[PDB]
Scaffold this active site. Structure first.
Site, PDB file in Angstrom:
ATOM      1  CG  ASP A 142       5.306  -6.898 -90.878  1.00  0.00           C
ATOM      2  OD1 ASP A 142       5.893  -7.774 -90.207  1.00  0.00           O
ATOM      3  OD2 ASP A 142       4.080  -6.674 -90.789  1.00  0.00           O
ATOM      4  CG  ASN A 185      -2.009  -9.535 -81.714  1.00  0.00           C
ATOM      5  OD1 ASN A 185      -2.976  -8.866 -82.082  1.00  0.00           O
ATOM      6  ND2 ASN A 185      -0.990  -9.823 -82.518  1.00  0.00           N
ATOM      7  CG  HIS A 215       3.506 -10.753 -89.865  1.00  0.00           C
ATOM      8  ND1 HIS A 215       3.747  -9.457 -89.459  1.00  0.00           N
ATOM      9  CD2 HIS A 215       2.360 -11.131 -89.253  1.00  0.00           C
ATOM     10  CE1 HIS A 215       2.786  -9.069 -88.640  1.00  0.00           C
ATOM     11  NE2 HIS A 215       1.931 -10.066 -88.499  1.00  0.00           N
ATOM     12  CB  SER A 266      -0.147  -7.827 -87.084  1.00  0.00           C
ATOM     13  OG  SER A 266       0.936  -7.260 -86.366  1.00  0.00           O
TER      14      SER A 266
END
Ligand SMILES: [Ca+2]
Length: 278
Positions: free
Chosen positions: A39, A161, A69, A224
């Site tokens: 990530d 998403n 994140h 996520s």
């Protein structure tokens, strides 16, 4: 073991019904397994990781998670307060810049790095990779995720998403990894979550409280956020000897909570990640 007043996501994967607040888990808590968080990186110094997190690779000028994140996702995997597998080892692979975006070539390099780096770690219970990333379809990104999976790493990837079919998104559309959709607290599919036949399982993905950069916490939504729940669950089940890396995705789908989700389009699995604890 029981965590009272847990994040609803943790409580959900230890319950056959929504609305509960306690996360029930086995004491082992993923001890002896490793989870690569691929990530933006991990603020390894966050007190919630208790020294169980470290950066092993970065593809940018710093290994520091300047976005939050990756630290959020690492936290849902195995932070003490917000993690599924609270004693797992966390390895940060920073393939995303501090703006959350990374070129496909870098994401492929990060997955090939994990497939190799695991050979010089001590993860007797097994290795998991959590990929809270994704873009348009790419056969090479799908191939990299498949390579990582076949090298003996349980790969969990976000469905994406877009509220669309995950077939048009990579590494979401790679059949041999574990593609994770997002559900909310009332057992609906998250409004943003991708769907489709390629999805294997759903995880808590809406308003997920986890760690953040600067030693803080914050709630965010996304597939996520559901992926680390499943990645942490796979590391948790691999520690209990219930499954292997090659089979963890099917095992989690075998032992899921079936038919509990709403707004699942026809053709998409209605399975919710569940640890079947006691
Ligand atoms: Ca699959």
């Amino acid at each position: 073991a029981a965590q009272t007043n847990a994040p609803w996501g943790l409580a959900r994967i230890s319950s056959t019904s929504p609305g509960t607040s306690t996360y029930y888990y086995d004491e082992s808590a993923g001890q002896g397994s490793c989870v690569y968080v691929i990530d933006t990186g991990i603020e390894a110094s966050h007190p919630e990781f208790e020294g169980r997190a470290q950066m092993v690779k970065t593809y940018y000028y710093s290994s520091r998670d300047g976005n939050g994140h990756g630290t959020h996702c690492a936290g849902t995997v195995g932070s003490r307060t917000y993690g599924v597998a609270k004693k797992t080892q966390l390895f940060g692979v920073k393939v995303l810049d501090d703006n959350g975006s990374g070129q496909y070539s870098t994401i492929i390099a990060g997955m090939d790095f994990v497939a190799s780096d695991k050979n010089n770690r001590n993860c007797p219970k097994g290795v998991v990779a959590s990929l809270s990333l994704g873009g348009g379809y790419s056969s090479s990104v799908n191939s990299a995720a498949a390579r990582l999976q076949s090298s003996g790493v349980m790969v969990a990837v976000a469905a994406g998403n877009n509220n669309a079919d995950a077939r048009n998104y990579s590494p979401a559309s790679e059949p041999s990894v574990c593609t994770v959709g997002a559900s909310d607290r009332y057992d609906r599919r998250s409004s943003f979550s991708n769907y489709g036949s390629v999805l294997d399982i759903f995880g808590p993905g809406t308003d997920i409280l986890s760690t953040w950069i600067g030693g803080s916490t914050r709630s965010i939504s996304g597939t996520s956020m559901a992926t680390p729940h499943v990645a942490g669950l796979a590391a948790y089940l691999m520690t209990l000897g219930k499954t292997t890396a090659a089979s963890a995705c099917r095992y989690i789908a075998d032992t899921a909570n079936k038919g509990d989700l709403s707004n699942i389009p026809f053709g998409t699995v209605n399975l919710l990640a569940y640890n079947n604890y006691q």
